[PDB]
Amino acid sequence: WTATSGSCKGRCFELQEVGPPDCRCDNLCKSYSSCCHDFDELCLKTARGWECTKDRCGEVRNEENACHCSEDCLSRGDCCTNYQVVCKGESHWVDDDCEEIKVPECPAGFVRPPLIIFSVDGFRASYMKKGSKVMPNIEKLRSCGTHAPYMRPVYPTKTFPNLYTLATGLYPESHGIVGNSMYDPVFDASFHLRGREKFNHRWWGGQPLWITATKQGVRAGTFFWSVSIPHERRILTILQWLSLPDNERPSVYAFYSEQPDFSGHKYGPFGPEMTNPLREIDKTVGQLMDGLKQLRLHRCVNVIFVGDHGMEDVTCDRTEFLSNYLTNVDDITLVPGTLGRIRAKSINNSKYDPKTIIAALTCKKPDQHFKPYMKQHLPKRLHYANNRRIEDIHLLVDRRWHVARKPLDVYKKCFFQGDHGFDNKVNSMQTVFVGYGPTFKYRTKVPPFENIELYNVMCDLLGLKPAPNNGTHGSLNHLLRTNTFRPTMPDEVSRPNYPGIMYLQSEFDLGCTCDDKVENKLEELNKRLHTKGSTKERHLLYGRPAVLYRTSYDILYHTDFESGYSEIFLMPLWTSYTISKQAEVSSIPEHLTNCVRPDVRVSPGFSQNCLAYKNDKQMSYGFLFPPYLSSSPEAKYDAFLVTNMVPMYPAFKRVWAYFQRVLVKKYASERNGVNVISGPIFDYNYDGLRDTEDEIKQYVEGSSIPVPTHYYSIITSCLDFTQPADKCDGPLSVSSFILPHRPDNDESCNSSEDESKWVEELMKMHTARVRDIEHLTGLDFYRKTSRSYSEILTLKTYLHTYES
Numbered sequence: 001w002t003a004t005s006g007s008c009k010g011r012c013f014e015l016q017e018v019g020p021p022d023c024r025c026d027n028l029c030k031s032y033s034s035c036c037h038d039f040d041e042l043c044l045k046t047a048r049g050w051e052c053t054k055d056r057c058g059e060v061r062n063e064e065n066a067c068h069c070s071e072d073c074l075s076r077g078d079c080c081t082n083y084q085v086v087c088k089g090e091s092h093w094v095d096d097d098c099e100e101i102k103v104p105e106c107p108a109g110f111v112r113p114p115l116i117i118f119s120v121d122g123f124r125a126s127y128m129k130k131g132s133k134v135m136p137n138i139e140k141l142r143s144c145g146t147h148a149p150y151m152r153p154v155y156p157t158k159t160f161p162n163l164y165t166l167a168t169g170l171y172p173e174s175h176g177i178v179g180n181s182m183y184d185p186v187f188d189a190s191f192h193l194r195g196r197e198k199f200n201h202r203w204w205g206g207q208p209l210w211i212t213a214t215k216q217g218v219r220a221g222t223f224f225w226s227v228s229i230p231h232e233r234r235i236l237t238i239l240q241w242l243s244l245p246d247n248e249r250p251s252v253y254a255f256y257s258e259q260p261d262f263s264g265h266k267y268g269p270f271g272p273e274m275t276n277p278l279r280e281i282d283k284t285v286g287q288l289m290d291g292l293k294q295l296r297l298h299r300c301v302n303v304i305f306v307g308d309h310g311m312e313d314v315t316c317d318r319t320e321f322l323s324n325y326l327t328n329v330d331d332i333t334l335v336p337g338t339l340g341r342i343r344a345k346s347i348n349n350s351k352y353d354p355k356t357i358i359a360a361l362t363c364k365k366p367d368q369h370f371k372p373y374m375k376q377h378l379p380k381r382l383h384y385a386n387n388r389r390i391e392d393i394h395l396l397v398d399r400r401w402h403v404a405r406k407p408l409d410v411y412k413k414c415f416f417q418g419d420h421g422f423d424n425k426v427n428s429m430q431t432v433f434v435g436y437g438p439t440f441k442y443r444t445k446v447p448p449f450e451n452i453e454l455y456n457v458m459c460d461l462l463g464l465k466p467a468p469n470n471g472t473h474g475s476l477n478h479l480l481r482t483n484t485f486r487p488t489m490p491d492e493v494s495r496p497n498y499p500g501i502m503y504l505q506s507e508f509d510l511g512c513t514c515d516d517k518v519e520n521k522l523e524e525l526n527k528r529l530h531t532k533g534s535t536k537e538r539h540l541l542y543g544r545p546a547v548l549y550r551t552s553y554d555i556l557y558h559t560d561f562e563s564g565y566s567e568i569f570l571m572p573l574w575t576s577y578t579i580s581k582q583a584e585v586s587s588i589p590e591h592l593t594n595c596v597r598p599d600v601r602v603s604p605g606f607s608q609n610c611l612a613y614k615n616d617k618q619m620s621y622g623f624l625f626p627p628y629l630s631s632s633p634e635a636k637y638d639a640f641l642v643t644n645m646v647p648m649y650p651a652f653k654r655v656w657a658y659f660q661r662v663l664v665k666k667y668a669s670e671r672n673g674v675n676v677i678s679g680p681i682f683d684y685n686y687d688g689l690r691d692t693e694d695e696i697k698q699y700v701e702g703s704s705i706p707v708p709t710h711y712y713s714i715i716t717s718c719l720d721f722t723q724p725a726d727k728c729d730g731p732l733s734v735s736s737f738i739l740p741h742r743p744d745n746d747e748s749c750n751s752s753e754d755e756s757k758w759v760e761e762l763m764k765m766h767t768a769r770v771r772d773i774e775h776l777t778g779l780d781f782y783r784k785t786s787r788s789y790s791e792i793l794t795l796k797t798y799l800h801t802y803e804s
């Protein structure tokens with residue numbers, strides 16, 4: 001109950017929320033049924049529209065007008081945005097030449113350049129080129145400022161997840177807004193876009209920019225705009241706030257447009273009806289820039305033009321129905337559409353079985369347009385699991401499709417021709433970034449980056465210390481003229497041991513055999529040299545990874561590879577090797593098929609053993625440095641050391657062997673050599689973070705050998721592929737993956753076929769950033785290169801997406 005019979009006189013769009021049941025005049029007032037009686041009359045004026053005309057110039061102020069063309073309007077801060085153009089012979093901002101903004105050019109009393117975030121819903125990356133002819137203001141921002149070819153959203157590629165990631169620098173799993181609808185079992189409550197539920201603070205985790213700003217003495221405008229406030233009035237409201245006195249004036253502002261998403265849903269991304277919404281957004285940008293120019297702020301304010309997600313072609317007829325797969329279809333609740341999430345109708349149902357639901361959804365139809373996953377099995381690059389609001393069963397829906405429970409759900413609740421929410425690597429989901437202003441670079445292209453990075457930059461732009469987030473601070477320094485954040489490499493926590501030969505063969509009782517007894521003085525000194533690190537400059541190109549937690553580990557050198565061998569996990573944390581373009585692939589000789597060799601540098605008590613793998617009927621083993629890429633028959637013996645062995649499901653060994661036997665050499669040939677770092681990952685609680693050993697849920701039967709949840713590889717080469725990987729003078733090129741270590745290949749529908757037909761496709765789905773691997777391993781890579789640390793941070797954030 002509000003008492004809506006106070007007044008908004010002189011409080012229109014007040015910045016501090018006065019508290020119920022005083023009546024409100026800020027702009028959530030609408031969403032709470034709490035506006036003062038006179039809010040519309042006083043705060044939402046519309047008379048005479050939004051543009052000065054020649055006849056209004058010098059008018060007598062009339063306070064009923066929506067905006068003013070009277071002589072006193074600039075000092076009152078409420079002219080129509082085109083006032084100077086119409087009434088003072090000025091040029092529209094868009095008609096002026098691009099002029100570099102080397103320093104902020106701010107009115108007196110401005111302590112720092114303001115930041116305006118101009119967010120556009122559903123603005124697909126390719127609109128920048130395809131609509132260029134009708135968006136002159138946006139094209140000027142883009143060509144004059146700093147821009148990327150596109151910006152990668154987070155998954156799911158929906159509005160609230162992406163805008164709140166923008167505001168927090170957090171993955172949806174961490175901020176809590178994991179979809180446009182959710183259930184929180186702990187709260188026992190449901191969240192929807194409609195409804196008033198979404199306004200409860202309990203949903204919204206992390207620390208959004210406006211709170212970061214306010215805690216550190218920087219004032220913010222509103223970020224949420226009521227749907228009934230027209231765009232022209234949101235712009236005027238921002239410009240009015242910008243004429244407040246210095247002690248009252250915000251430094252950060254946001255403007256939000258429901259378009260072009262709104263029309264894209266109706267008309268598809270490139271429907272003829274989409275030209276007009278693009279024109280209208282551009283005109284709104286024009287109003288802001290002309291309003292800034294009137295206030296002498298157009299060379300003072302940093303503007304960020306950013307989208308939340310793109311838009312794909314999606315129709316009613318491209319819908320998969322769970323009722324075509326399950327019989328029990330009425331025992332589930334599906335969160336439907338461009339993703340699926342499944343849980344039980346009743347938690348009083350003890351008969352509900354995830355495993356049978358998954359099996360009933362797996363490769364059941366030959367052209368099936370969705371794939372089921374337990375959420376812990378989703379590609380780690382989605383970071384979509386560590387939240388109670390994300391249901392254990394997930395469906396990744398093919399682009400251009402929907403999933404629904406039953407057909408009646410689609411015609412008792414055709415219309416739409418566009419939608420979004422797919423995998424965030426999908427081209428049609430990519431969105432836009434432009435930064436324009438004194439702090440951004442001039443006429444600069446930057447590579448595509450992820451929207452989780454922007455929070456740190458926005459904090460830099462405003463002199464704020466960012467709250468802890470998923471960005472990599474420094475990775476976007478290259479966007480900025482000044483206000484760079486000069487990151488420093490994290491300190492190594494554990495220093496390695498460098499063991500020599502300390503154990504006689506007979507001290508080992510591992511139940512291993514190798515056929516390796518086959519006796520020179522030239523070749524005697526050589527082997528010694530290799531075991532002491534003589535080839536290490538070839539195989540370890542970017543220094544040793546730093547271990548950023550407390551543990552016990554050994555560096556082991558070999559002719560063909562170097563490893564960091566964990567005494568706690570009984571296997572390498574990392575294995576590093578370089579494969580030149582000219583390298584030869586060989587087979588595992590017949591006599592060496594089951595060969596495993598004790599490592600006389602490492603104690604029996606810190607070694608794996610062969611017996612465990614023999615007794616474990618489900619578990620086999622593989623090798624991190626592949627025997628197939630041995631430099632010589634003699635070097636090959638090194639690859640069979642027990643210190644190179646790792647636990648692997650037979651089904652996973654199909655993947656791993658094909659990667660090691662065929663793909664590494666392919667990459668070396670295409671990229672002119674590669675450096676490979678491979679190792680295990682343990683993420684049993686699916687939080688994206690290295691497990692401690694007391695979190696491991698599975699071991700090789702009857703042993704203390706932990707079973708990895710995933711295997712990674714980082715594959716680096718020279719960006720200038722005329723230079724070999726091992727003699728690269730300039731920037732690097734990387735691709736990485738985090739393959740799930742699964743006992744079946746049920747994820748791959750074509751896995752009964754030869755590996756040449758499915759393995760590479762799996763690996764692409766599980767592409768990863770180096771930084772993803774860093775979080776999962778507590779390692780820090782690229783410690784010793786020629787390159788600046790900011791560049792390396794950019795490289796560590798790169799994702800190879802394999803889109804056309």
Ligand SMILES: *[C@@H]1O[C@H](CO)[C@@H](O[C@@H]2O[C@H](CO)[C@@H](O[C@@H]3O[C@H](CO[C@H]4O[C@H](CO)[C@@H](O)[C@H](O[C@H]5O[C@H](CO)[C@@H](O)[C@H](O)[C@@H]5O[C@H]5O[C@H](CO)[C@@H](O)[C@H](O)[C@@H]5O)[C@@H]4O)[C@@H](O)[C@H](O[C@H]4O[C@H](CO)[C@@H](O)[C@H](O)[C@@H]4O[C@H]4O[C@H](CO)[C@@H](O)[C@H](O)[C@@H]4O)[C@@H]3O)[C@H](O)[C@H]2NC(C)=O)[C@H](O)[C@H]1NC(C)=O
Pocket residue numbers: 170171173174175176202204205206383386387388468469470687688689775
């Ligand atoms: C992306 O970046 C983010 C942000 O940097 C990273 O997330 C951080 O990870 C940290 C490590 O996991 C984590 O730290 C823990 O937090 C506990 C304090 O928590 C509250 O306070 C903060 C600060 O204001 C707040 O942000 C938190 O927010 C969560 O809480 C609610 C969820 O209901 C939501 O409002 C919000 O969305 C957020 O949810 C998300 O995070 C939680 C976990 O915090 C998830 O469960 C959700 O799914 C969702 O993802 C909190 O309100 C602190 O209590 C923990 O301490 C334990 O462990 C330490 C080890 O040193 C030790 O001292 C103790 O043993 C202690 O153990 C005791 O508690 C145990 C666990 O309950 C118990 O089992 C023991 O036996 C003991 O009693 C811990 O420090 C930090 O909170 C999050 N921050 C955020 C915002 O998510 C994220 O990791 C990054 N992602 C990647 C991939 O890098």
Ligand SMILES: Cn1c(C(=O)NC2CS(=O)(=O)C2)cnc1COc1cc(Cl)c(C#N)cc1C(C)(C)C
Pocket residue numbers: 117119159160163164166167168193194209223224225226227254255256
């Ligand atoms: C998205 N949105 C809506 C909306 O969705 N309205 C419909 C749901 S309805 O049914 O109520 C009508 C209204 N205003 C906004 C803008 O919100 C933002 C803008 C930016 Cl720039 C950032 C950042 N950084 C963050 C946000 C929020 C979402 C975190 C507040």
Ligand SMILES: [Ca+2]
Pocket residue numbers: 121122158159160261308309
């Ligand atoms: Ca949206």
Ligand SMILES: [Ca+2]
Pocket residue numbers: 682683684685686687688689690691
């Ligand atoms: Ca973990």
Ligand SMILES: [Cl-]
Pocket residue numbers: 117118119223254255256
């Ligand atoms: Cl916004």
Ligand SMILES: [Cl-]
Pocket residue numbers: 156158178179180181335
């Ligand atoms: Cl959703």
Ligand SMILES: [K+]
Pocket residue numbers: 613614615616617618619620
């Ligand atoms: K076995």
Ligand code: NA
Pocket residue numbers: 745746747748749750751752
């Ligand atoms: Na399969």
Ligand SMILES: [Zn+2]
Pocket residue numbers: 122261262265420
């Ligand atoms: Zn939409």
